[PDB]
Amino acid sequence: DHLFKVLVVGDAAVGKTSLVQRYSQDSFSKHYKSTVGVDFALKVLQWSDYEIVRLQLWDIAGLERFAAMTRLYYRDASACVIMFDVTNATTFSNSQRWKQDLDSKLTLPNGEPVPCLLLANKCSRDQIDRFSKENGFTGWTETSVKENKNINEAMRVLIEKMMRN
Amino acid sequence: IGLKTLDLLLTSGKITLLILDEESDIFMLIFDAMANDEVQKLGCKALHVLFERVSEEQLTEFVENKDYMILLSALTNFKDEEEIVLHVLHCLHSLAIPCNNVEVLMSGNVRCYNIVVEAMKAFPMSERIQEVSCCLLHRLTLGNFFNILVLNEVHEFVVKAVQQYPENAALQISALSCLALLTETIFLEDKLFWLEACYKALTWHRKNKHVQEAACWALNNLLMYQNSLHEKIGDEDGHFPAHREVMLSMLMHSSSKEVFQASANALSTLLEQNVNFRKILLSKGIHLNVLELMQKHIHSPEVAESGCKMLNHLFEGSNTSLDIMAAVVPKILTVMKRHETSLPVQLEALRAILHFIVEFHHKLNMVKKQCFKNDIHKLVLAALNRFIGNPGIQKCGLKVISSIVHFPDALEMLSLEGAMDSVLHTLQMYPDDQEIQCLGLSLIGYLITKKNVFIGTGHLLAKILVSSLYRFKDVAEIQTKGFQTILAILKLSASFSKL
Amino acid sequence: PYNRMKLMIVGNTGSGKTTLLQQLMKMQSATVGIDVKDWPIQIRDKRKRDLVLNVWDFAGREEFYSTHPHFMTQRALYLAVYDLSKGQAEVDAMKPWLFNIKARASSSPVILVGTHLDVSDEKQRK
Numbered sequence: 001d002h003l004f005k006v007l008v009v010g011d012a013a014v015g016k017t018s019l020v021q022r023y024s025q026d027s028f029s030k031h032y033k034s035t036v037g038v039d040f041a042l043k044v045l046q047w048s049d050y051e052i053v054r055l056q057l058w059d060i061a062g063l064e065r066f067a068a069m070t071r072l073y074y075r076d077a078s079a080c081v082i083m084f085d086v087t088n089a090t091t092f093s094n095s096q097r098w099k100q101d102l103d104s105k106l107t108l109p110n111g112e113p114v115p116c117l118l119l120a121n122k123c124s125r126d127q128i129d130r131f132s133k134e135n136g137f138t139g140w141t142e143t144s145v146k147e148n149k150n151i152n153e154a155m156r157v158l159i160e161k162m163m164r165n
Numbered sequence: 166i167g168l169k170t171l172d173l174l175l176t177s178g179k180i181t182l183l184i185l186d187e188e189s190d191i192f193m194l195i196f197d198a199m200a201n202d203e204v205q206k207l208g209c210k211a212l213h214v215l216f217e218r219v220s221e222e223q224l225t226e227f228v229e230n231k232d233y234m235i236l237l238s239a240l241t242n243f244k245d246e247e248e249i250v251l252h253v254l255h256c257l258h259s260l261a262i263p264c265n266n267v268e269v270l271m272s273g274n275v276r277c278y279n280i281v282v283e284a285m286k287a288f289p290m291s292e293r294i295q296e297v298s299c300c301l302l303h304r305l306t307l308g309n310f311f312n313i314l315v316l317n318e319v320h321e322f323v324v325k326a327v328q329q330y331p332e333n334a335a336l337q338i339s340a341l342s343c344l345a346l347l348t349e350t351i352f353l354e355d356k357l358f359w360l361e362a363c364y365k366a367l368t369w370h371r372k373n374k375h376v377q378e379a380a381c382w383a384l385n386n387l388l389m390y391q392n393s394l395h396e397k398i399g400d401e402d403g404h405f406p407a408h409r410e411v412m413l414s415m416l417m418h419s420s421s422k423e424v425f426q427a428s429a430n431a432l433s434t435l436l437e438q439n440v441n442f443r444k445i446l447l448s449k450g451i452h453l454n455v456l457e458l459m460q461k462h463i464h465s466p467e468v469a470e471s472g473c474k475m476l477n478h479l480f481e482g483s484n485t486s487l488d489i490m491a492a493v494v495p496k497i498l499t500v501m502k503r504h505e506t507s508l509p510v511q512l513e514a515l516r517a518i519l520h521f522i523v524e525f526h527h528k529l530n531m532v533k534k535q536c537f538k539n540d541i542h543k544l545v546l547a548a549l550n551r552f553i554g555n556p557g558i559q560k561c562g563l564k565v566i567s568s569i570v571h572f573p574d575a576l577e578m579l580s581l582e583g584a585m586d587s588v589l590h591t592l593q594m595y596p597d598d599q600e601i602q603c604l605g606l607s608l609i610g611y612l613i614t615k616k617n618v619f620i621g622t623g624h625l626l627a628k629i630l631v632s633s634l635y636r637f638k639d640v641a642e643i644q645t646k647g648f649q650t651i652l653a654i655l656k657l658s659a660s661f662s663k664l
Numbered sequence: 665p666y667n668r669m670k671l672m673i674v675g676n677t678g679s680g681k682t683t684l685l686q687q688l689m690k691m692q693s694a695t696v697g698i699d700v701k702d703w704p705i706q707i708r709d710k711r712k713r714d715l716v717l718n719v720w721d722f723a724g725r726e727e728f729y730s731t732h733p734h735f736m737t738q739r740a741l742y743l744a745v746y747d748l749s750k751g752q753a754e755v756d757a758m759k760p761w762l763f764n765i766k767a768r769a770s771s772s773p774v775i776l777v778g779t780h781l782d783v784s785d786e787k788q789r790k
């Protein structure tokens with residue numbers, strides 16, 4: 001039995017709740033709306049026999065991007081994911097801003113930054129390759145929120161990467 | 166000019182201690198200074214700055230003299246003067262710190278009328294004056310708060326103050342704490358604005374522990390005394406989404422036990438109010454989460470009690486899986502074991518265990534064996550044996566044992582621990598209660614062994630059985646259980662019939 | 665260090681013990697039993713540590729004399745207020761007090777403060 005907390009960050013109106021409802025409540029696409037406040041979801045994964053892991057997904061509201069991101073959101077947080085809409089370079093710049101803020105406001109018992117996943121929602125991989133190699137993130141994966149084509153494999157890879165540490 | 170120079174000098178700091186260590190009685194100087202109106206305001210009312218350090222008895226003498234002088238001068242000159250009224254009120258705040266002086270300040274309810282008038286007229290749209298007066302309101306709360314009309318007036322004033330200045334932490338803490346205490350007082354329209362203020366307090370002050378604790382305490386106490394608006398909270402439009410805010414506050418400030426207690430009590434009252442919120446918090450993953458929080462906070466009994474109350478009100482009326490059982494029951498067992506003397510913690514843990522305990526068969530057998538290996542029987546027997554009062558824990562313990570007995574391995578450990586003597590003693594001390602008698606009479610036949618009636622000795626058994634059956638002769642269930650128990654006993658030894 | 669001491673004021677009735685205590689420290693029909701008070705004396709100089717004299721104003725009427733020696737102890741200072749308007753019999757009247765003071769506290773300061781001198785003559789004083 002183990003507990004982990006994953007913080008989902010990104011821009012606004014980019015389906016931040018879409019990925020977490022597809023991953024936990026098994027709902028894809030649907031109407032896209034704005035997130036009033038921080039919301040929570042529970043995921044249960046049977047990664048190994050007699051070893052059950054629980055995941056708490058926190059999908060932080062991106063409306064307060066200019067606001068000072070409180071360290072209490074990231075306090076005791078174990079893992080993170082960055083999700084950006086692939087139809088705007090402004091979303092890419094926002095994801096850069098979130099990654100920089102996280103690198104400025106995160107700590108670990110070992111001191112190394114928590115694993116990060118660059119998720120391209122609502123699917124130009126060559127353009128993203130430069131930042132994939134430059135930012136030093138754990139991995140990069142594209143997916144579509146409406147189709148849920150690659151969310152499961154990406155999250156499984158992220159959980160395995162976390163359990164490697 | 167002397168007062169002005171003294172006031173600007175005392176802003177430097179590290180000199181007020183030197184001034185108080187003088188010999189010319191600067192206190193008496195300021196008292197003798199005051200009908201100038203410009204004076205006293207000129208004095209800068211640094212009496213409050215001095216009242217920061219004045220020693221309580223010296224402060225009480227200061228209280229008689231200052232109440233007289235300040236009340237008269239302040240009322241006139243300051244009814245016309247924001248600074249004078251503010252300074253007099255904050256000096257009264259510094260003066261009212263000792264617990265003995267509150268009755269002095271309420272000798273003729275002059276302080277209450279003064280603060281009410283100041284809130285009404287002195288500061289219609291002023292922040293610092295309202296903050297000081299509201300701090301007075303919070304400080305002036307005790308067992309002597311049965312001032313009905315004054316209570317209504319001050320409640321209206323503080324509520325108006327919250328809706329007119331919700332962006333500062335000076336008001337929200339004191340206002341919401343006094344608001345909770347006074348709503349507990351008076352409740353023996355308003356609710357919409359009250360929860361609006363509470364929701365704004367939770368949302369706009371997420372980083373301040375005290376504001377969140379006070380606001381969720383106010384929400385809890387209001388919902389406790391007002392159950393009609395349980396449907397007025399929710400994610401649907403027209404309802405304040407306070408449940409997520411309470412959870413978020415609890416999680417950000419898990420290091421603080423006070424916010425945990427207040428938030429857990431608040432959402433426990435909310436869950437008891439309406440059952441629709443249950444199975445939604447479970448979907449949010451809070452049960453094992455609050456279990457982890459109690460694991461972090463184990464040195465205190467209040468945090469464990471509040472968490473057990475949350476579990477009791479969260480898992481009521483629902484059925485979980487074996488994984489949830491294996492993840493929940495050991496934590497509650499550890500919490501009960503570490504806290505063996507606290508009556509509320511034991512009662513809440515027993516209630517939670519009772520409400521939660523009752524391919525697939527093998528897994529459940531494994532869960533039962535793990536629970537048995539966690540020394541559940543010893544803990545529950547110790548809890549219900551050491552604490553012979555508070556019959557509720559007795560009912561919970563008998564129910565838990567009744568659920569325990571039909572486990573695969575229950576009989577041997579139950580007999581070794583000596584549960585039978587505990588059951589017999591419980592029946593002896595509670596002759597008149599019905600549920601205890603029914604549960605005990607059903608249980609006795611279940612845990613009876615040949616050792617308990619060895620060599621024909623079983624007189625307390627017969628005495629208790631006959632007494633229980635005779636006292637409740639018309640209750641069909643009690644008689645049925647008693648006669649089944651008697652037949653079970655006779656199946657072992659026939660000599661018992663003689664007894 | 666502990667700056668605390670008991671001060672005892674004794675004498676016959678009408679001597680002026682209560683009035684003397686009021687004058688020094690700052691409806692006196694009688695002082696029934698013993699009046700216990702605390703005298704906070706912080707000398708104006710900060711060098712002198714603040715004393716708290718435990719004042720025990722004793723009765724003057726003879727009905728209370730039986731229980732007085734139980735509360736007379738060492739580690740205390742004694743006053744001996746004697747009226748001057750009465751004449752010279754006050755000296756005789758204070759002998760029982762001095763006897764009990766000596767019996768209970770052999771080594772303790774004794775101060776004899778003749779009061780009500782505003783009416784007394786110098787021959788009586790001598």
Ligand SMILES: Nc1nc2c(ncn2[C@@H]2O[C@H](COP(=O)(O)OP(=O)(O)O)[C@@H](O)[C@H]2O)c(=O)[nH]1
Pocket residue numbers: 675676677678679680681682683692693694695696722723724725749780
């Ligand atoms: N002769 C005289 N007596 C005074 C004067 N002022 C006060 N007294 C009396 O002195 C008494 C105090 O003596 P005290 O030792 O307290 O007597 P006790 O109360 O009987 O033990 C008071 O009861 C006063 O009535 C004064 O100016 N002249």
